[PDB]
Design a protein around this ligand. Structure first.
Ligand SMILES: *[C@H]1O[C@H](CO)[C@@H](O[C@@H]2O[C@H](CO)[C@@H](O)[C@H](O)[C@H]2NC(C)=O)[C@H](O)[C@H]1NC(C)=O
Ligand SMILES: *[C@H]1O[C@H](CO)[C@@H](O[C@@H]2O[C@H](CO)[C@@H](O)[C@H](O)[C@H]2NC(C)=O)[C@H](O)[C@H]1NC(C)=O
Ligand SMILES: [Mg+2]
Ligand SMILES: [Mg+2]
Lengths: 481, 481
């Protein structure tokens, strides 16, 4: 009965990059066709616009500050990770008899002997990199075949990037141009095996596209009309087409729910090798709309009618929506998301009315930075980010320091999705929204306790993964292509 | 059964002016002796530190913004006044059979044909001035006998100040040096008449001391050791001694509850002819402690034991406390005060935990300026005032513009009653108080609707009281000494 679920999650992909979201030069045919036969969201969000906190909110349905996933992101030597008491979507579904698998980027911790890796958090199978593909030296890696080097060199002084098969190093570093093929092969096996055992599968595909540095296989190099950022987006798009064909071939089209979203806004610091937030303001690292609002598509033939919704939805609602769909019971913890099945099935409206946004570096004195309720969004604090540097808007830059706003900056997103015109710079409708927004912020700030910081547990270079354990000299000896 | 109640309310009198509150040169023997045989409050407050809003909160037990008593104060030509639907303490007690009377300053409105004057708000008898004694020309009035003129001239272009007997002009202007004697005579008659009819009395004595310009009868001129401000405080003090003697003479000491407080902090703009907030900061016109915290004494032999309380109390609690004491039922409206009888009778604690402070000029976008809960006080907005000009502290001056604080300025008043050291300039106790304070402000701001402004209804010079109605030329012809 339960449907097969495929969750595709891109990296550093903006609201404005898909062809079907208006980009003028992107090449995204498979995703455009998924949009045309399914539900496209205009108002779907993540609560925090950084890699780690966003992946944690997705898998647990819980605001990242509750389990210490702040500040910033995790690094290869981090001691901390997503606590093992947290229940993930993979576990909710595993206990209901799903065969669960994950391909790609984890970024939720490695820890002493890989205690925080995926196999310990409900995934039966796992093929991927445990953090971002730029958190290790890349001046000698090939990003585009036959021999175009990755640009800029990535993070120095670390072990090369490891490709893992569950808990074992399969390659270090992997060959970037062939990663996609590896991941499609893995996905195909997971599907077929689940079919054979008469059980539903759950595929978590956490792509490295479109994070820096850009790369692709040889079928896409110089073929998109948007340079390296495009080639890489085009490969991600072809991966979606490949998964849809594999779902075709096995006669599972009407029994599989396919969801596509992305973790956080574009890193405009990469300039034309980085994403695009379209009409929205600023990008990764900020609580402006270009940082937190992402593309989101839902496709399930004969169940989800083709259309466009403007209803409020969050990555936080994915656990409870998927549980409900699979007839799995919810964990016994406070959750911050809701079941969106009525909306998906067209029998009801989204139950979500409000959204809460935390910054990259949160603190308990300040609390939530921005809150949206209906079409209104208030900003109590504003701050630019180096990840959103280089565009013409000065509020996006790292030089825009942390600034308090009281009364808050107040925008009507139905008319000013670009956050250009502060309404408080009077009306009874506005005043009532203002008072609601202020009370929602004070209620959440008083009820939420911050879990102890995982990131502040520190770093220990002995925690880096090494293909040749015991090796010397570290870290350059750790390798095995 | 119900006790006789005498409520003495001074004008522009600071926390630091009574001898029993530490002043080094004031002469206040009767009040010091009342303090020595009764209850002295260290933490008693008014919600707004201006004449009109404070008198409204006292008589109704309701925050002044609910019935439009803002912004600023009322003037002789004001069209507005305290709405007649509001229920006052005088009415609560009149309906329980009290013989009620008021001597002194009203400042709650005059209106077309004196519709807002005291006789329409539950007082049986009324002898006094309908607004402050400086809201009319005083360059020719004698402030101190035999012929010392009032200093500075007061407000120009208006009708002289009227002394009224219910709704009729008894004199215009009155002779300042003999006002006290008039008021004591009136008080004595009210007491005796109530005794004779076997009924309890309620005397509301709203003194003009110690508002500018200072004045006194001849027994006090140049006799205090603190100049004109002192002479005037000394007369107010002798008035209290006279009322206590009159209560003695009629054998009513153990059957009468006597309360003394003041409406708002000192006007330091008058320099050494103005009051003193002692250790507290700033004065009239501000939401700093020297503006809102006043002297307060309760005396009732054989019922209230002599002592000092630090418990929280407000002018807002006087209606409900007096109702309860007289066995009178409370009006059917939302009240913002509580019954303090247990505290007064020494059988319980004050039920009040929090206090809310509004500025002279409030608005619905900003809401409450400052909130106190337990020993903590947060300031969300700060602002100086011309009424608090001339001292060495720059935050008190009119040049200190309206400033938002987020996070708020946070003080521990048990250790820093002077509001000098911001705690947020960390601890778990502090953080919990912070979150409580923020939530209390957002709850009150969301629940309180501002009543339509009475003061903004405008002015009409035809509303000025005239001893010779029809007169010309106005306003100088209006007079009758
Ligand atoms: C690591 O672990 C999984 C299982 O723990 C490995 O896979 C299994 O895959 C083969 C066929 O592909 C089956 O015969 C087994 O039954 C599978 N087990 C389960 C529980 O599914 C796999 O080689 C590794 N994960 C991947 C795909 O890298
Ligand atoms: C105006 O009104 C009151 C009454 O409305 C006047 O006073 C009364 O006072 C005399 C004795 O002083 C009594 O004989 C009457 O019974 C009183 N009436 C009440 C209801 O108390 C008074 O002259 C005026 N008020 C004052 C004192 O100025
Ligand atoms: Mg990312
Ligand atoms: Mg006053």
């Amino acid at each position: 009965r339960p449907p097969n679920i495929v969750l595709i999650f891109a990296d550093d992909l903006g609201y404005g990059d898909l062809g079907c979201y208006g980009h003028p030069s992107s090449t995204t045919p498979n995703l455009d066709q998924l949009a045309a036969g399914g539900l496209r969201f205009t108002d779907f969000y993540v609560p925090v616009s950084l890699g780690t906190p966003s992946r944690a909110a997705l898998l647990t349905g819980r605001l990242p500050v509750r389990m210490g996933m702040y500040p910033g992101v995790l690094v290869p030597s981090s001691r901390g990770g997503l606590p093992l008491e947290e229940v993930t979507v993979a576990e909710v579904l595993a206990a209901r008899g799903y065969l669960t698998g994950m391909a790609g980027k984890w970024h939720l911790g490695v820890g002493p002997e890989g205690a925080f890796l995926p196999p310990h958090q409900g995934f039966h199978r796992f093929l991927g990199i445990p953090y971002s593909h730029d958190q290790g030296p890349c001046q000698n890696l090939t990003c585009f075949p036959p021999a175009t080097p990755c640009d800029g060199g990535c993070d120095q002084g670390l072990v090369p990037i490891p490709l893992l098969a569950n808990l074992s190093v399969e390659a270090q570093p992997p060959w970037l141009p062939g990663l996609e093929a590896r991941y499609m092969a893995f996905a195909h096996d997971l599907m077929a095996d689940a079919q054979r055992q008469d059980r539903p599968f759950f595929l978590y595909y956490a792509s490295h596209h479109t994070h820096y540095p850009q790369f692709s296989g040889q079928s896409f190099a110089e073929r998109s009309g948007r340079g390296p950022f495009g080639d890489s987006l085009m490969e991600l798009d072809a991966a979606v087409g490949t998964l849809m064909t594999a779902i075709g071939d096995l006669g599972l089209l009407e029994e599989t729910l396919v969801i596509f979203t992305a973790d956080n806004g574009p890193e405009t610091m990469r300039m034309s090798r980085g994403g695009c937030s379209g009409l929205l303001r600023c990008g990764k690292g900020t609580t402006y709309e270009g940082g937190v609002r992402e593309p989101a598509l839902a496709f399930w033939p004969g169940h989800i009618a083709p259309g466009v919704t403007h209803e409020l939805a969050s990555s936080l609602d994915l656990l409870p929506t998927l549980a409900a769909l699979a007839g799995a019971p919810l964990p016994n913890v406070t959750l911050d998301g809701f079941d969106l099945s009525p909306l998906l099935l067209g029998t009801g409206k989204s139950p979500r009315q409000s959204l809460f946004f935390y910054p990259s570096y949160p603190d308990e004195v300040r609390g939530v930075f921005a809150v949206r309720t209906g079409k209104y969004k208030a900003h109590f604090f504003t701050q630019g980010s180096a990840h959103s540097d280089t565009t013409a808007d000065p509020a996006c830059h790292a030089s825009s320091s942390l600034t308090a706003h009281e009364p808050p900056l107040l925008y009507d997103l139905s008319k000013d999705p670009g956050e250009n015109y502060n309404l408080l710079g009077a009306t009874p409708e506005v005043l009532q929204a203002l008072k609601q927004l202020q009370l929602l912020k004070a209620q959440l700030d008083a009820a939420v306790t911050f879990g102890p910081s995982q990131v502040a547990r520190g770093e220990d270079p002995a925690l880096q993964i090494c293909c040749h354990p015991g090796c010397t000299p570290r870290p350059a000896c750790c390798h095995c292509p």
